[PDB]
């Protein structure tokens, strides 16, 4: 039944990129209050399957397309409340809302898209939001301001477990080639141009940017797990303009630049696009594959690209002035020719500590995998797909095997002291003593396990305080160490919950 | 396969009777050059069955209708280049192209509509043309100049005889 | 009537580094098996059938297991620093961090794997730039090392493409 | 079908170790241009099986023997262009061409002898060459300068993988 509701306000001139508003999913249910809200209070915990319905007068004469973004962990909110760039709004689970189709509906299995059960009385980790943004604007302003209604339908029942089923389980050697929620920002064609080209890079491991801000997301993270890929790109094209706009596209793949000869262009294996629909284009390359990421000074056009050639139009009646937008979605690489995985089932760098200023140094880890900071020494964090996966999910849980390595700063013969691994259950103040471990500095290496998790079952990607095992590294002769390196290797079954994004 | 191509330029004010241009069928194939063009050189003579495709953004808001005129013997060209009277453009085999229907296609059995086989190295009698004219104009001018693409699809094979089958 | 094989399924010498002039030394390997050069130290390359096979094919691809061995130039009691193996995916500038590895100089030996290849699948026997895993050896107290020896042992399935020759 | 062609010039006195010329395999196909060349542009990548044919007037009265050397990775070109020592010309895949036998033919599985697929728009690694040298000279000079014709026959189809099967 209807569980909650809310209202989004549309301005008469709804320009591309306008932030329209955010609805707080738990507030929609509690403000309504709600046969379902009252069932919830009794359940305590719910893991709903929602039907979201956006009520919306269908209209074929505007060109308006909106994006609903499911941000369960409140990761893009701060970055979109002024103006909402598509790189942010498409970096979390999301849905295109076409004005021509009118009332919109979708399902959200909160167990998958989110991963943790909702507590009736308060937010547990962060408060789940729905963001509404405009992806492609109206061709001309409408007659007046208006509104759309957002509705949550659900049959709430008591949740049996805290945690959902994991969206993803860590494995270096496994990137299928299928994607979800991979939508490219809109491509635009001017009508003042008899022909035109728009390139879309196929170097999919590259991290997207908004100004100086890197937007880590799961899709690019997945692609980075491979060295490169060849095959056929299967996707869908949406033409986001009024019925009175129209265009014909030649869509084809090209390597390192584009041909300047129209006759050569049409000897390539491309496809024509006249209207909303799916497409398959072969990734074209001298090596049959394009690399997953770029090297220094390389551009994305140096490799394989998906090229959209306007060969007839766009046309519109006078005096229209709006550009004709194309929204491309990439669904999978079919018949994939994959490179080696970029990483093997091995250790990788978590952090290097160096340049110690005090002999006594104590690095608290606890039960988290995270970025360190120090006032007393130099922290150098590792960047790899695992760390990105940690950043691109709301919750995670697993066990890390650690390898510690270090080299001396002083003469070996003069060396003394230890790298000590304190292992507790609880905290430094009231904890129980586990497999704490004293490595004499002369060992020059040591190993240990780290539980990334806690009594509840999973860690958010923030600071939190939940009873768990607790770890710390204790140096007593730190100035005698030139570098302390910590490598980790996730034990099988390292789990991630609720795909999201991470702007920095 | 794609055998040849060409481009027609359309004005923002496309008025009734405007000449839009002429494509030369043999030049479309030779300028492209062309897996089919190369097959042609070896055949010497070809009696193609062409599929002509005009790529063209569909639009219901203009009222535009064009005529493609197949002038294999170059009989109306001279008289339509400043302005095309429909009496000329409809006096040879032709096809109506409605803007509301978008991309357009038809078959031309060169054996029937033309009658003599094409020689790879030079025009035999006269050079076969496609004329593009506007039959009914747009209700108001469009936002800007644009273009349409004309494509010839064919699987060229060697012609056994010089002459086709007689139309009449 | 054949003799014993000249080599067994064992390691063989890839390269010896010696006579270091600077304490900071960084030897870039990347994803290639090739001949080193240095202005700051003495390079002695190994000659064996594997190296010849690399030279006598257009392309190759495989994995090398490496053993690093070294002896000290200074007194053991005075020694400090490390032989560090940097392992990246990409390049020094924008790469991702793999199984990089810090061998305290007192270990006097260490092991690592090296991917000889790249996203395309194989290396030419020249310099090339194709995204792959990337390796480097970093010395911080190189003057304290009398010799750094690198042995390798190809993992089964090391592959060569297109037989050719190599004049020097 | 015939995919490309080229010409080698024989001097009236062809002496042992004379260099006769180099044909660039990809240029032979692109200069011809070529029903096969045009199929190639659409395929992007090809891994041809070539039949090479050298047309050549058979003669039992000269003693002439030539060597065609398949140098896919351009390894001997530099060292043979003044004089072609047999040590170079026989160090890559090669074929003896006896004058007494006249017109010569062989197969080149580009997948084996080369190992990487050819990209229509540019050389990927190095540009594949055929060198023609004289192995044993004529017993006395001939009456005049002459030429031989080299032909590539292939049915090019799109390559599924970048790499061939490993020779070794």
What does the DSSP assignment read for C25-70?
Answer: EEEE-TT-------SSSEEEE---HHHHHHHTEEEEEEEEEEEEEE
Chain B contact set for D34 (CB, 8 A): 38
Give me the count of residues in chain A.
504
Q: Give the CB-side neighbour count of residue A138, counting CA atoms within 13 A.
A: 17
CB contact (8 A) between residue D38 and residue B38 = yes
CB contact (8 A) between residue D119 and residue A284 = no
Structure tokens at A100: 């021509």
Residue in A230, A267, A286 nearest the CB of D41: A267
Chain C contact set for D164 (CB, 8 A): 161-162
Q: Round to whole Å and give the CA distance between C155 and C166.
A: 24
Cis-peptide into A319, omega within 30 deg: yes
Q: Round to whole Å and give the CA distance between A316 and B142.
A: 6
Q: Round to whole Å and give the CA distance between C167 and D75.
A: 7
Closest CA to D108 of D152, D76, D150: D152
- A250 CA: distance to closest CA in chain B (Å): 10
- D42 CA: distance to closest CA in chain A (Å): 5
Q: Round to whole Å and give the CA distance between B134 and B64.
A: 8
Q: Resolution in A for the shown PDB structure?
A: 3.0
Angle at C142 between CA C141 and CA C143, to 5 degrees: 95
Residue in C53, C59, C166 nearest the CB of D75: C166
Q: Round to whole Å and give the CA distance between C29 and A287.
A: 23
Identify any residues that bridge with A119 across adjacent strands, giving them in sequence order: A45
* Contact status of A289 with chain D (Cβ, < 8 Å): yes
Cis-peptide into A421, omega within 30 deg: no
* Contact status of A111 with chain C (Cβ, < 8 Å): no
Closest CA to D98 of D129, D54, D140, D145: D54
Q: Give the CB-side neighbour count of residue A262, counting CA atoms within 13 A.
A: 15
Q: Round to whole Å and give the CA distance between C21 and C24.
A: 9
Closest CA to C117 of C71, C56, C54, C62: C62
* Contact status of D4 with chain B (Cβ, < 8 Å): no
Alpha carbon C103 to its chain centroid, in Å, reads: 16
What is the C-alpha end-to-end distance of chain A, expressed in Å?
40
- A333 CA: distance to closest CA in chain C (Å): 16
A159, A47 Cβ separation under 8 angstroms = yes
Residues in contact with B35: Cβ distance below 8 Å, sequence separation at least 6, in sequence order: A267, B1, D35, D38, D39, D42
- Chain B: residue whose CA lies nearest to D36: B35
Closest CA to A89 of A205, A224, A235, A210: A210
Given CATH 3.40.50.1000, say whether it is the number of domain A343-504.
Answer: no
CB contact (8 A) between residue C118 and residue A227 = yes
- Identify the DSSP state of D17: T
Cα Rg for chain C, rounded, in angstroms? 17
* Contact status of C85 with chain A (Cβ, < 8 Å): no
CB contact (8 A) between residue D124 and residue A289 = no
Q: Round to whole Å and give the CA distance between D59 and D61.
A: 6
A126, A73 Cβ separation under 8 angstroms = yes
* Contact status of C49 with chain D (Cβ, < 8 Å): no
- Interface probe for A, chosen from B58, B99, B150 (most Cβ of A below 10 Å), is B58
DSSP H or E segment with residue A315: strand A304-315
* Contact status of D159 with chain A (Cβ, < 8 Å): yes
- B59 CA: distance to closest CA in chain A (Å): 6
Q: How many CB pairs under 8 A join B and D?
A: 12
Q: Round to whole Å and give the CA distance between A120 and A131.
A: 22
Q: Round to whole Å and give the CA distance between B65 and B46.
A: 32
Helices A35-43 and A25-32, interaxial angle, to 10°?
A: 110
D98, D36 Cβ separation under 8 angstroms = no
CB contact (8 A) between residue A347 and residue C77 = no
Which position has the token pair 């738990």?
Answer: A26
Chain D contact set for C164 (CB, 8 A): 71-73, 75, 91-93
CB contact (8 A) between residue A246 and residue B59 = yes
Helices D35-43 and D25-32, interaxial angle, to 10°?
A: 110
Q: Round to whole Å and give the CA distance between A46 and C133.
A: 45
D15, D137 Cβ separation under 8 angstroms = yes
D167, C162 Cβ separation under 8 angstroms = yes
Residues in contact with C37: Cβ distance below 8 Å, sequence separation at least 6, in sequence order: C43
Q: Round to whole Å and give the CA distance between A239 and A235.
A: 13
A13: three-class secondary structure by DSSP: coil
D48, D161 Cβ separation under 8 angstroms = no
Given CATH 3.40.50.2300, say whether it is the number of domain A1-342.
Answer: no
Closest CA to D67 of D48, D49, D54: D54
A444, A405 Cβ separation under 8 angstroms = yes
- Interface probe for D, chosen from B4, B32, B35 (most Cβ of D below 10 Å), is B35
* Contact status of B35 with chain D (Cβ, < 8 Å): yes
Phi and psi at residue D154, to the nearest 5°: -165, 155
Phi and psi at residue A63, to the nearest 5°: 85, 0
Residues in contact with C25: Cβ distance below 8 Å, sequence separation at least 6, in sequence order: C17, C38, C40, C41, C138, C139, C142
Q: Give the CB-side neighbour count of residue A455, counting CA atoms within 13 A.
A: 7
* Contact status of B100 with chain A (Cβ, < 8 Å): no
Residues in contact with D29: Cβ distance below 8 Å, sequence separation at least 6, in sequence order: D3, D4, D36, D37, D40, D152
Residues in contact with A33: Cβ distance below 8 Å, sequence separation at least 6, in sequence order: none
DSSP H or E segment with residue B110: helix B110-113
- A381 CA: distance to closest CA in chain C (Å): 9
C112, C66 Cβ separation under 8 angstroms = yes
Q: Round to whole Å and give the CA distance between C1 and D3.
A: 46
Touch between chain B and chain C (3+ CB pairs, < 8 Å)? no
Structure tokens at B107: 């078959």
Q: Round to whole Å and give the CA distance between D72 and D129.
A: 6
To the nearest 10°, report the CA torsion of C71, C73, C79, C82.
Answer: -50
Residue in A194, A267, A317 nearest the CB of B142: A317
CB contact (8 A) between residue A408 and residue C94 = no
Chain A contact set for B144 (CB, 8 A): 191-193, 315
Checking D102-107 for CB contacts under 8 A at 24+ apart, the result is: D102/D56, D102/D57, D102/D58, D102/D59, D103/D53, D103/D54, D103/D55, D103/D56, D103/D58, D104/D53, D104/D54, D104/D56, D104/D68, D105/D51, D105/D52, D105/D53, D105/D54, D106/D51, D106/D52, D106/D68, D107/D49, D107/D50, D107/D51, D107/D52
Q: Round to whole Å and give the CA distance between A502 and A76.
A: 8
Neighbours of chain B (3+ CB pairs under 8 A): A, D
Q: Round to whole Å and give the CA distance between A265 and A502.
A: 39
CB contact (8 A) between residue D41 and residue A268 = yes
Chain C contact set for D79 (CB, 8 A): 167
Identify any residues that bridge with A397 across adjacent strands, giving them in sequence order: A495
Neighbours of chain A (3+ CB pairs under 8 A): B, C, D
Chain A contact set for B34 (CB, 8 A): 263
Q: Round to whole Å and give the CA distance between D125 and C121.
A: 13
The arrangement of strands across the sheet holding B19-24 comes to: B19-24, B129-136, B65-71, B94-98
B49, B110 Cβ separation under 8 angstroms = yes
Intrachain domains A1-342 and A343-504 with the same fold: yes
C145: three-class secondary structure by DSSP: strand
- D45 CA: distance to closest CA in chain A (Å): 7
DSSP H or E segment with residue A8: strand A2-10
Chain A contact set for D41 (CB, 8 A): 264, 267-268
Strands (E), A316-360: 324-338, 348-354
Q: What is each CA distance from B143 to A309, A315, A387, C28, in whole angstroms? A: 20, 7, 51, 59
- Interface probe for C, chosen from A340, A477, A487 (most Cβ of C below 10 Å), is A340
Q: How many CB atoms lie within 10 A of CB C5?
A: 8
Angle at C89 between CA A407 and CA C42, to 5 degrees: 55
Q: How many CB atoms lie within 10 A of CB D42?
A: 16
Which position has the token pair 């908004």?
Answer: A210
Structure tokens at D103: 């017109």
Residues in contact with A405: Cβ distance below 8 Å, sequence separation at least 6, in sequence order: A444, A445, A484, A485, A487, C101, C102, C103, C104
Chain C contact set for D113 (CB, 8 A): 162-163
Q: Round to whole Å and give the CA distance between A349 and C98.
A: 6
- Chain A: residue whose CA lies nearest to B152: A266
What is the C-alpha end-to-end distance of chain D, expressed in Å?
31
Q: What is each CA distance from A418 to A361, A378, A436, in whole angstroms? A: 11, 19, 13
* Contact status of C121 with chain A (Cβ, < 8 Å): yes
Domains of chain A, by residue range, sit at 1-342, 343-504
* Contact status of D38 with chain B (Cβ, < 8 Å): yes
Structure tokens at A489: 């290797």
Query: What is the architecture, at CATH level 2, of domain C7-168?
Result: Sandwich (2.60)
* Contact status of A60 with chain B (Cβ, < 8 Å): no
Touch between chain B and chain D (3+ CB pairs, < 8 Å)? yes
- C56 CA: distance to closest CA in chain D (Å): 9
CB contact (8 A) between residue C165 and residue D92 = yes
CB contact (8 A) between residue D167 and residue C163 = yes
A284: three-class secondary structure by DSSP: coil
A184: three-class secondary structure by DSSP: coil
DSSP H or E segment with residue B111: helix B110-113
Which position has the token pair 């995204």?
Answer: C131
- C4 CA: distance to closest CA in chain A (Å): 36
Cα Rg for chain B, rounded, in angstroms? 16
The arrangement of strands across the sheet holding D2-10 comes to: D2-10, D146-153, D49-55, D104-109
Chain D contact set for B42 (CB, 8 A): 35
Angle at A379 between CA A374 and CA A382, to 5 degrees: 140
Chain A contact set for C92 (CB, 8 A): 296
């Amino acid at each position: 039944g209807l569980a909650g509701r809310g209202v989004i306000y549309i301005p008469k001139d709804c320009q591309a990129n306008r932030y329209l508003g955010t609805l707080n999913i738990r507030d929609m249910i509690s403000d309504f209050k709600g046969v379902q809200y009252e069932k919830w209070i009794t359940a305590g915990l719910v893991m709903p399957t929602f039907k979201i319905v956006i009520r919306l007068p269908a209209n074929a004469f505007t060109g308006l397309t909106w994006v609903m973004s499911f941000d369960a962990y409140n990761r893009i909110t701060s970055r979109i409340t002024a103006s909402a760039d598509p790189v942010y709004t498409l970096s979390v689970p999301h849905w295109l809302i076409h004005h021509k189709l009118g009332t919109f509906s979708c399902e959200i299995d909160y167990g998958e898209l989110c991963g943790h059960a909702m507590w009736f009385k308060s937010t547990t980790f962060e408060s789940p939001r729905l963001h509404f943004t405009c992806l492609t604007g109206n061709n001309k302003e409408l007659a007046a301001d208006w509104q759309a209604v957002v509705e949550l339908y659900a049959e709430l029942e008591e949740a049996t477990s805290f945690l959902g089923k994991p969206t993803l389980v860590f494995d270096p050697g496994v990137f299928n080639g299928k994607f979800q929620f991979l939508t490219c920002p809109p491509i635009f064609f001017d009508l003042t141009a008899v022909t035109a080209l728009r390139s879309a890079g196929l170097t999919l491991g590259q991290v997207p940017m908004v100004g100086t801000t890197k937007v880590y997301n799961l899709n690019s993270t997945l692609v980075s797990c491979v060295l490169g890929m060849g095959g056929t790109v299967r996707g869908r094209v949406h033409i986001c303009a009024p019925i009175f706009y129209s265009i014909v596209l030649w869509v084809v793949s090209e390597w390192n630049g584009t041909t300047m000869d129209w006759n050569e262009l049409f000897k390539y294996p491309g496809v024509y696009v006249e209207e909303d629909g799916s497409f398959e284009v072969k990734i074209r390359s001298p090596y049959h594959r394009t690399p997953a990421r770029l090297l220094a000074g390389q551009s994305q056009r140096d490799m394989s690209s998906l090229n959209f050639y306007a060969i007839a139009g766009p046309i519109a009646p006078s005096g229209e002035t709006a550009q004709l937008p194309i929204v491309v979605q990439i669904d999978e690489i079919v018949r994939p020719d994959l490179s080696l995985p970029s990483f093997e089932d091995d250790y990788f760098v978590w952090v290097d500590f160096s340049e110690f200023t005090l002999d006594k140094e104590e690095i608290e880890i606890g039960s988290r995998f995270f970025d360190f900071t120090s006032n007393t020494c130099r922290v150098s964090m590792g960047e790899n797909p695992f760390a990105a996966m940690i950043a691109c999910h709301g919750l995670h849980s697993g066990v890390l095997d650690l390898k510690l390595q270090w080299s001396l700063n002083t003469e070996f013969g003069k060396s003394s002291g230890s790298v000590t691994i304190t292992k507790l259950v609880g905290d430094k103040a009231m904890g129980l003593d586990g497999p704490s471990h004293v490595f004499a500095i002369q060992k020059l290496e040591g190993t240990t396990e780290l539980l990334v998790g806690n009594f509840a079952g999973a860690n958010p990607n923030t600071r939190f305080s939940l009873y768990s095992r607790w770890m710390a590294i204790k140096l007593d002769q730190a100035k005698s160490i030139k570098v302390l390196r910590v490598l980790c290797k996730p034990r099988p079954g390292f789990s991630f919950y609720g795909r999201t994004s991470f702007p920095v």
